[model samples]
Target chain A: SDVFHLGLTKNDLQGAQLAIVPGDPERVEKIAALMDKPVKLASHREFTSWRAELDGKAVIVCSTGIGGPSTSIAVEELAQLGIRTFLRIGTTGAIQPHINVGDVLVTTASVRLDGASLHFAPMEFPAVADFACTTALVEAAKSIGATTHVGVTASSDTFYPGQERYDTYSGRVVRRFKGSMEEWQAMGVMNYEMESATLLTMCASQGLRAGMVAGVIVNRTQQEIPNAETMKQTESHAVKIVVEAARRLL
Target chain B: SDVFHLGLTKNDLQGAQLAIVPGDPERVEKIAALMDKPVKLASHREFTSWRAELDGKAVIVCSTGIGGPSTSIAVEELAQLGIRTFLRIGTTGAIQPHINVGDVLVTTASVRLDGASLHFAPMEFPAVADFACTTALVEAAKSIGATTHVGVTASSDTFYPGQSMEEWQAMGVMNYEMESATLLTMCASQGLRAGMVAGVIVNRTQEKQTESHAVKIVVEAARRLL
Candidate 1:
C-alpha cells in the first residue's frame, strides 16, 4: 500500500534515498528548483513531495506544515518509502547576542519541548542531529562563507507566548516564560524555532539521519524583528545552505 | 485614568471588589444575568465587562478571550480598575480515566505548560488557585450536587499538539484548558487572589449540562465569596 499521508507508492521514489523536508508548503518548489531535473511528485494534506537530482542521485523534497504532529507524520511516511536521510530547512530567531539578523543557524540538537517526540520516544531519549549530517551542514555553510552559529535550538509549540515574545494580540508574555529568554541565553542555547527536536528525535530513534539549517529571522537579544523583505532574502540564503549541505551529504 | 485594554476607568469599577471572568465573551452576558440588574459596562478587543449586584454588592463579570496573554491583560487591567478578587469560568477536557464527561474541574494549581504564565512569574512559581476561591467553588459544586474533580490542569497554548495530552494523562493532570494557569499565575504574581471552575465539555478519555452547571457553580461561589 502507498504511504498514508504522503500519497506515494514505493515505485514513485524507487531510487530516492534522501529527503529534504521543510515546514512550509510554499517553499517546496523553491527548494526543489535548486536541485537538478525537478518535478512535482504529489500533494496530499500538508505534505507536498517533489523529485529532483542532488549530486546525480534521486532526492525527495517535501513540505511538513507546522508543528510536531504534521512533522512527525511526514517523517514517518517518508521513512517508509526508503528515505534514509533527512534535512530540515526553516527560519529561526536567535537568543544569543552575537547572532546577527539573517545569519544561518545550524541546530546541533534541540530542547525537548517539542511535544510530538514523546509519542515516539521517552523523555530520557535525546533529540540530536546526526553527526555526519551535522558536519556536512557546518562544512557546507563554511565553504559558502555563510555567517553561521551552531548550537541547540528551543523548538516551542506556539510562536507567540511559548517563545516568550510579547508580540501578540495581547502584547503580553506570562510569568511562565517571563525571564526565559535570558535563561536560554545564559544556558548557551543559540536560537528558537519549531520542529527540529521532533525531526531529530524521530529520525534518530528509527536509525535515520537528520539535521536542520535555519535562517536567523530575528535576534531576540538585539531587539530586532524580522523585516518582511529581509526575511525572504534570508530564507533564500537558508535554502542555498540546505541545498549545498545536501550535496555534501551525498 | 482608564486601564488600556479594558477601556474602563478606575472610577467606573470603583465599588466592584469581586469579579467573575470567563474565557468566552458570549458567556459574560449569560453569567451576568444570574446576578441582579446586570448592565453592560465596557467592551474593547476581547474583553467584555458587565456590572451586576451579588449579595447586595456590585460584582464585575468580564470575558478574557482565549489564552493567557489576554487573560493576563484582563487580570492586570481589572486589578487596575480596583477589582480585588477573580473567579474564571470556562470549559475543559478531562485527562483522567475516572472523570466523566460533563463533570466540573476546579483548578487548585496547574502544569506550567501555559505559555503565558512565564511572563508573570518564574517557572518555579506555582500557578496555584486562591484557597478561598477554590474552596468556594468546591463547596458550591457539592452544595449543588454536581460531579466535580479538583487538582492540576495542563493549560496548554494550543488546543492540539503542544498539550502532550497522552504524556499528561500518564502524569495525572486533572484536565486541560487554555486560560486557567494564566489566570491563576497572573493573579498570584500580583498578590491578587484568583481561582477557576471549568465545565467539562470534551473528555480526552472519552457538554450542555456541564456548561450550565459550571456557570451555576461559579455564581454560587461568587455568593460564597461575597
Candidate 2:
C-alpha cells in the first residue's frame, strides 16, 4: 500500500510503474511536456507525481523537494506505491572546470554528505549510482545531443555552505568542499547535490532500480553560469533523454 | 554578575577552579577522592559539577549527560560562569590501534559529528581542542608512566549506528564517545578553551587494557590539564 507514511492511503496510487523524481515540481511539469499524454496523479508539499507516456510506454515523474530528509521520505513513499524503477532528473553545479554549465552529469556515485541515508545503511555502505541507469543516462545524453559528464556529485544538507558554494548550485565549491574532496573522492563521490544519495541508498536497500541524471547549471571551475535560457533548454533536453531511456528500458 | 547564565551569583563557587563533571552523581564522589578536597556545588540531571583545587589553581568540572544538545548547553552555561577552559574526562571507546583499553586519549581536535553544534553554526566549523590542554594532558600521561595517543575524536549522536564500528571503532576512528565535540564546538565558536581525556573502558585501539589502568591514566591527565 502506502510506502510513505505521510497519510496517503493504498488506493491513492495504482498502476504507477516508472517514476522520475525531481527536486522542483515545476521541473516535473517540464518533464511532463515531453510525453504524449501526461496526466497529473498527486501533488503534495514537495512531492508531485504525474502519469504520462513517451512512445506508448507508461512513465511517471515525481519531484522530491531538496535535501536527503525530504528526498528519503519521497523515495520510501514512492517505493511503496509500486513504482519500481526511478530516475532523478534534477539540476546540479559543476565543481570541476572542464565540465560546462549546460552539460549533463550522470552521477557515477555521490558523496554521503547527506545524513539521511544512515537510517537505512552506514556511511561506508555505498550510495552508488546504478550501473545500468548510469549507462542509460549516458546514452540518453548522447541521443539528446547534450554534453554529459559522468562523475561523483556531493549530496549534502545545506546547498551553498555545505558544498562550499554561495547560491543554490553556485559553481563555487566552498572551503569545506576543497578539504573534503580528497576524502569524498576516495570514497567514490563524483559531484554534489541534495537527493541522489538518499534516492540511491533507499533504492538499493529496497531492491528497486534507481539512478540520477543532472543538468549542470553552474560551472564551479570557471565561476560561470549558463544563461537562463540555456539552463532551461538543457533541462528539457535531459528530460527527453530520460523519456527515451525509459522507452528503451521498456 | 553571574557568568553568562549559570546564576552563580557571587562567592558561590569553592576554592578550586578545577571542576569535575560526571554524568553520574555517584561518580563525582568517587572522583572526589582523587583530590585533597572535593565539594559538590550544583547537581542537575547529569550536570553534576564539582569544584576543587588541583596544583594550587581553582578548577571545576561538570557532567553533561549523554548528547551534543545537552553538552552544548552545559558549555554555554559554564562559560558564562567565568570558566574559560574545559576538559571532559569521561569514558570512551578507543578507535585507534596503538591505544589500549586502559590507555588515555588526548584529543587534539574533534570531528563535528555531534548534532548540537549545527544549531549554533555550520557543521564545517572546526571543533579543535586547546593545544595547552593537550600538552598538559600529554605530560600528565608521561608523568604517570602511561601510554597516550593524540588525534581526532568523532563525537557523534547515536552510538549504535552513528559509529557503525565493526569491532568497537573499525569504521575509521580512534574512538567513539559523547561530549568531546560538544565541548570543542562551543569552545571554538565562543573563542574559549576545551579538550578531553577519554577513559578507555573498551579497547577500541589495539587491545583492551585493564580498567584500573584506564582510571589511573585518565585521572592523572585530568589532574595535569588544570
Candidate 3:
C-alpha cells in the first residue's frame, strides 16, 4: 500500500544508512561530485537516489524534492525501507537583519506550519534536528569562514500565500499579518522554510535522527536580496559544511 | 477560487435563523423527526440540509458529515449561503462520571484538536461559543427538566486515533465529545454564533443516559441548546 511518490522500491534503498537529502535532483549531481566514485542507484520523478563513498563512509544521498508534504512521505517510506539519519542541506530566507544572504542557518527546531506533518503527529509536538547533524553543520560552516545562524525555523506550506507573502492565488491580509518578524521573534520563531518541521517531527516520533541547513537568500528585515555570486557561494558553503560534519561523524 | 467541496450554492436553504448541525446525514433525518414540521431542502454529499419549525421559530438543520476537514467546508459555504446562528446537536461518548449516559453536555469551549481549524487561525485562538447561545441552551434544558453537564468539550479530527482516547474514543477525563471545537473555532474566527449539545450514549449504568434514556436526554438537551 506504499504510494512511492518518488517511484522507488525496497531494493533501491534497502538497508541504506545515513542519507543526505537535498531538494533538487540536479543537486544530486553536485552531491555525487563530492563523493568518491558515486554510483547512481535510482532516479524517478523528483527523487534521484545515489550511493557514494564519502571518506569511505557508506553514505546515500537522495533529492527529497520541495515542501513538507512530500518530505514527510519521503521520511515515512525511507524509514520503512531501513534508512535513517537525515541531514537536510538546503537554503532559507532570513528574517533577521543581522543575517546576510549566503549564510547558513542551522535549525534547532521548526515552527510546525507544514500541513503534511499534521498527518503524522499533533501540533504540540516539536520538530527538533538531531544534535549530531546540528554539530556537523555548525563545524562545516565555521571551517569555511561562512557565518551561520542557529535556532528554530518556520515550516510553511505555501512559500507565497502560506508564508504571508503577496501572490496570485489566495493572498489575504490575514496571511501577511503573520510575516512581521517581530511577531515571530516574540514567539521565538527564528527563520522560515518548508521542510524542517516534517523532518524533525517524524524523526522525533520514530526515534530517528534529522537536521536542516538553509543558505539565506533574502533578509526580510533589511529587504535585501543576495546577488547571484553571493547566493552560489552560500549554497556551496552550506553543502561543504554538511559534508565535512558527516565525514567527522565517521 | 471558491470551489466548495460540499457542492452547496446559495438559495438552496429555507429561511431559518437557527441551524441544528449533526455530523451524520442519517442523524439529520432523526433530528428532523424531533421537530414539528420538517422539510428536506437539499441532499448534496454529506450535507443533507432540512428546514423545520419549532415554537413558531423557523430553523434549518443540516448534516456536516464527519471530521474537521469536511465540517469546515460546511461552515464556510453555509456562511456564504446566509447561515448565521448555529447549534451542533449530536451524540458523544462522555469522559466524566458525573456526565453519564443520556445526560446533556452543554459545551462551553473545546480543546482544539481539530487540525482543520489551525489552518484558519493560530493555536492560541480560543474555540469559544457565543455567550447568548450558551445561555439559551442552558435555559432550554432547564425548562425541559433535563439534567445536564456544562463544561468544555474536545473536538478531534479522527474519532478513533484523533482523540487522545482509548478504544471507544473516551479520554477518561472530564470533557465532552467531538466536533464542538471546530464549530466554535469557525464561529469565533468569522464572528458568528455557535454552540454544541452532545447526547451521552456510552456512559452506561450511571445516573446519566443509560439505554432508553439516551434519546430523551438528547431531545431535551437540544431543546435547551436551541
Candidate 4:
C-alpha cells in the first residue's frame, strides 16, 4: 500500500534495516553516495528515498524537507515501511560562542518547540535521542578526529523569528524577543535547527532508535559565519560521522 | 507574476478585499456557494482559491490544508498577491464543557502552541485576532441567531494527539483547531487584519459530535462585514 504523503510502500524499500533522514532533498544523494550500490527508491512531496548498503548492511536514506510537519510525516511513513533506526544528519546554527563553525554536535535531547512532536506526545515528554545511537555517533566522531560536542539542541520551525531573530518585514522586534539566545545559553542549549525534535520525539514514542549529528554552520550568538571552504569541510564531517556510526552499528 | 505555491496572480484577485480561509479543499465550493456568482480562481498544492460577491463586495475563499506550515505558506503567498483581510471560517473541537458541539466561536486570542507562528514572531508575542474584525464576527453571529462565544482558542499542529484536549481545557482554552494561532501571528506581524469564527464540531469534554452549522453563520457574518 502506498502512503498518502510520502508515496512510499513496504515493497519499495525491499526490507531495508536502517534509515538516515536529512532535512534537505539535495542531501539525500550526498548521504546515499557514502554507501555501496545506492539506488533511488522513491521521490515524492519533499521525501526522496534511496536504498543502499553500508558495511554489508542494508541502509536507506530519505529527505524530510525543512520543519517538524514534513519531518514527522517522513518518519511516520518510513516507520510504517519497516525501517526502525533513524539518524538525522544536517546543519545547525551554534548558539554558544565557543563552538566554532563546522564543529559537529551529537544531540542527546532537544527543546520541544516544534509543533509536529506535540501530536506524538505531550510537552512534558522529553525529545531525546536513543542512547545506543547517540553513543555510536559520539564514538564515530572521535575516531574520525572531528571536533564534536554532545548536548541539548533547540529545534525551531522557522529560521528567523522562531529563533528570536528580528523580523525583516515589520522591522520591529516583539517584546521579549531580546536576550532569548542568552536565555538559551544559560540553559546550555548547544545549537538550533528545524527537524531533530520531531524526529527524536516520534522515535522515542514509537520505541525506535533515533539520533542527530549536525555540523555547525553559523554561530548565531557570536555572529561568526563560516567561509564556504570551512562549511563544506564541517558539513562533510557530519556526513562522515553519521556514516561511520551506521557502519559501527553493524 | 504568479506566486510559486498558490499558482495565483494579483490579477486573479482583482477586486477582492477580503479572503475566507478554510482547511479542506473540498469546502471551498461549499463556502463559495454562499456568495453570488462564485467563480473558481485557482487550485494548486492543496490551495483552492475562489472568487465571489457577498452583499455587493468582492471576497475570496482559499483552503489552507491542515497545519501551521501549510497555513503560513498560504498567508505569505496570498499577502504577496495583495489580498489583505483574512477571516478563517473553519470547524473546531470544543475543549470547554459549557460549549456544546455546533456552537460558534469568535476567536479573541490563541495560545501559540503551533510551531509555524514561532517562525513569524516570538513566543511571548500574542496571537490575537484583529479587534475590529473580531467584534464584527461577534456581531454577525449574534445578528444571525447562532449561539456564539468569544474567547481564547488553541491552535495545534495535529488534529488528534497534538491537541491534548483535557490538558487544554484545564489551561482554559475554549476550543481547538489546527491553524488559527499561526494565522493570527502571521497576520499580526505583517500588520494585516485577521479573525476566526469556528463552528464547534466536536465537544472533546462531552465526547459528542455535531455537523457544522458554522458556514451559514460565517457567510451571514461575511455579508454583515460587507
Candidate 5:
C-alpha cells in the first residue's frame, strides 16, 4: 500500500537509493535545480517530492514541511520506498556569534528539543548524524571553498515562542529564553533549525545514513539578518554540498 | 497587535474568560451545541473558534487541528488574546486494559511524549494539569453519573506511528491522545489553568467501542466548570 500520509507508493521513487530532505516545499525546487533531468514526482499535503538525475545517478528531494511531526512522516515513508540515504538541506539561524551568515553549518548532532524523536527512542537517547554522511558533507563543502562548521544544532517546534523569540501579540519574551540561548552557545551549539534532530534520530534508529547541511541566514545572538543576495548564495551552497555528498556516498 | 496566525482580534472573543479545546473542528460544534447563544467567532487553519454562554458564564471552544505543533499555535494565540482558563475535550485511546471503551479519562498530568511542549519547557518540567480545573472536571463527571478515571495520559504527535502500546503501557500511561500535554505545558508556562477530559474510542488491548458516552461527559463537565 502507498504510505497513507505521504500519499506515495514505492514505485513513485523508481527504485532511487538516496533522498534529500528540505523542510520547506519551495526549497525542493531550488535543490532539484542543481541536478540533471529533475522531474516532479508527487504533491500532497506538505510533501512535495521530486526525482533528479545527477551524473546518471538517480536521487530524490522531498520536502518535510515545518517540524519533526511532518518530517517523521517523510522519513518513514521514504525508508519504506527503499531509499537508504537522507541529506537534509535547509536554512538555520546560527546560535553562536562566531558562525557568520553564508557559512555552511553541517550538523553532527542535534539537541532533541524535538518531540518527534522521542517516538523512536527515550529522551536520553542521542540524536547523532551518520558519521560517513557528516564527513562526506564536510568534504563536499570544503572542496568548493565554502566555509563549513560541524557541530550540534537545536531543533524547535514553534517558530516564535518555541525559540523564545518575542511573541507577536504580547511582545514579551518567554522565560529563560535568553538564558537558554547563552547556554546552548556555551555548549557549542552551532545553529538552530526545526527538523534535523527528528531526522537524525529516526534515521539512526532505522540503521540508515542521515546528515544535515544548512545555510546560516540569521544569527540569533547577534540578531544579524543576511541580505537577499547573501541568503541566496548561502542556501545554494548548502544545496550544492548536499548534491555533491550524495554523489560521493551513493 | 492582532494574533498573526489565528486570524482573530481581541475583540472577536468579546472578553470570554474560559476556553474549551477540542482536537477536531467538527467537535467544536458538538461542544457549542450544549451551550446557550452559541456564536461562531473565527475559522482559520484548523482553528475553529466559537463563543457561547454556559450557566451565565462566557466561554469559548476552539479546535486545535491534530498534533502538538498546531495545538501549540492555538494555545499561544488564544492565550495572547487574554483567555485565562482552558479545558481540552477530545477523544483518546486507552492503553491500560482496565480502562474500558466509552470511559472518560480525566487527565491529571501527561507524559511529555509530545514535541511542542519540550520547546516551551525542558523534559524534567512536569506537564501537570491544573489542580483546581482537574478537580472540577472529576467532580462534574461523577456528579453526572459518568464513568471516569483520573491519571496520566501520553500525548503523541503522529496518529499511527508515534505511539507504541507495549512501551507506553510499561511507562504506566493510561491513555493516548494528541493535544493535552502541549496545552497543559503551554498554559502552565503562561500561568493559565488547563485540564483535559477525553473519551476513549479505541483500546489496543481489546475491541473498539462505537458508542460516544464521553462526549456527554465533557459537555456536562464544561457546564459545571464554566
Candidate 6:
C-alpha cells in the first residue's frame, strides 16, 4: 500500500524538498526545461515527473492530471517520497469581470468545492495557501510585470457543470449550479481551477507548504476562451513566474 | 431539454408531487410494485422510473444511479419536471457499533462528504432533511414495528478507502451512504422537501433483508401524505 502511483521511490526524487505541480501531463517536460539539466524521472497514469536543478538544488516538476482526487493522491505520494513544499501552477478561467484573460492568479485560499479534500479534514478546516509560497509567487509576478490577482479560488471537481459552465451532456447548467458562478463572482472569487483546495488543505493538514499560480486563459463572465497562441503564451508566463518564485524561495 | 437524463417529460410524470428515489435501477420495479398498480415509465442511463398511486395521488419511484453528481442531476431534472418532495430509500453501512445490520436509519442531517453538494451550496449550508419528511419516515418505521435509528449520516463521494470515517463516526454519525447530502442540500436549497431512509445491509466495522422493510417504510410514508 505504501508503493507509489508516481511509479518511483524516494531514491528517484534525489532529495528534492520542493515540487511544482501542473495538471496536464504534457506540460511536465516543458516546465522541467525551465530549470537546469531537466530529465524525466517517472511516468504513470496522470503523474508525470522530471527532476531539474534550481539554484544548484534539486527541484521536481510533476503533473497531477486534473481535479482534487488525483491531485490529492499526488500530494500524499509525493509527501511519502519526501517532498514537503508544493507550488501549483495551472490554467484557470477568470470568474470575476475585473480579471482579464492572461492574468496571473495566486491563490491565498480556496473555497472547499473540491470533494477530495474532505477525506483529509472536515469542511470546517480552511484550505489556505502557505504564506511564504504565496509571497514568493506574488513577488515574482510583480517583478515580471504580470497582472496578478491574489485571493480566493474556487476549486471544482467538474470542469463543465461544477463551475457552473455549460456542460457537454445537457448543454445547460443545472438549477443548483445555475446561480453559483454569479455567486462566486459576487463573493470575489478570483478564478476557477481544480487542484488547489485539496493541495492547500492537505498540505496544511500535514504541516507542509503549498501555494498556486494559475494562468487565466478564459474569462467566464464574458464567455471568452482564448486562442491557442494566447493560451500557450499565458501558460509560458505562468511557468516563468513559478520558476522565479521557486528561485526566490531558495 | 424537455426530457433530460431521466428520459421522462412532465407529461410522463403525470403530475407527481412526491418521488421515492432508489440508487439501484433494478429496484425501481421492486419498490414501485409496493404501491398500487405500478406502471413502468422510462429507463435511461442508470435512471429508471415507474409510476404508482398512493391514495389516488401519483407518486414516482425513480433510480438515482450511484453518487452525488448523478443524483443531483436526477434531482434537478426531476424538480424541473415538477417533483417538489423526495424520499430516498436505500442501503447503507452502519458505522456506529450499537446499530445492527438491517436496522433502518433515517437521516435527520448529513455530514456533506459528497463533493457534489458543494456545487449547489457552500459548505456553510447545513445538509438537513426536511422536518416533515424525517418525521414521516421515523413515524412510518415505528408504525411498522421496525427497529430504527435516526441521526446524522455521512454522505461520501468515494465508497472505498480514504473516507477515513473515524472523525464522523465519533461525531455520532449513524451510517454511510453515497447520495443523501447532495439530495438533502439540493432539495433544501431549492425549498423542496427531501429526506432519506437507509437500511443497514452491512456494518462496515462490525458487519440483510432490511431492504424490503426499507421499501415498506417509504411506501407507508407516501400513503401517509394522503
Best candidate (score: DockQ): 5
**Candidate 4: TM-score?**
0.66
The candidate with the higher TM-score, 1 or 2, is 1
Estimate, for each residue in B1-226, the C-alpha lDDT of model 2 and write its tens digit.
Answer: 3532233533655433444454444555566556655666765433566666667666665665545544554565565455666666767777666777667777887766654455335677787877877787788778877667778787664443452455435545577765676677656666676767766777633632443444455456566665
Instruction: Report the Cα lDDT for residue B164, model 6.
Output: 58
List model 4 lDDT by residue over A1-250, tens digit each. Answer: 5777777778777778689888766678888998898899887655778888877778889987656776777888888888889999988778888888878899999987678987788889999999989999999999998888899998876555556765343444445445666788899899878778789998999899998999888776665457867567888889989988988665
What digit string (tens of lDDT, one per residue) describes model 4 on residues B1-226?
4774677888888767788888766677888987898999887645789999887778889988657776776777777677778888887678788887778889999988787887667788899998877987888778767788899998766544454566777887888776889999989877988889888887745422222457766676666665
TM-score: the better of candidates 2 and 4: 4
B1-226 per-residue lDDT for model 3 (tens digits) = 2223345445445455567777766677776778778888776544677777677666677877545544655665666666777877777777665666666677788887655456556788888888877777777666767678777776664333342444323543345444677679768876778877666777533533332233333444445544
List all candidate RMSDs to the true structure. 9.2, 14.7, 12.0, 6.8, 5.4, 9.4
Model 2, A44-76: lDDT tens digits are: 554567777766666777777645655666777
Residue A23 local lDDT, model 6: 78
After superposing candidate 4 on the true structure, give the runs of residues whose Cα lies further than 4 Å from its correct spot. Answer: A171-177, B1-66, B69-154, B159-177, B194-226
The 10-residue segment of model 4 chain B with minimum total lDDT is: B204-213
Worst 10 residues of 5 chain B by lDDT: B206-215
Best by TM-score: 5
Better of 1 and 5 by TM-score: 5
Q: How far is candidate 6 from the true structure (C-alpha RMSD, Å)?
A: 9.4
For each model, chain A TM-score?
0.93, 0.86, 0.89, 0.94, 0.94, 0.95
In candidate 6, list every pair of residues with a backbone clash: none
In model 5, where do residues sit more than 4 Å from their true spots?
A: A29-45, A51-58, A114-126, A139-147, A156-178, A223-248, B1-70, B81-83, B87-90, B96-104, B113-126, B131-151, B156-173, B204-226
Candidate 5 - CAPRI tier? acceptable
* Evaluation by DockQ, superior candidate among 1 and 3: 1
For each candidate, what is the lDDT? 0.80, 0.64, 0.67, 0.79, 0.79, 0.82
DockQ for each candidate?
0.08, 0.02, 0.02, 0.22, 0.25, 0.10
B43 in model 4: Cα distance from truth in Å? 17
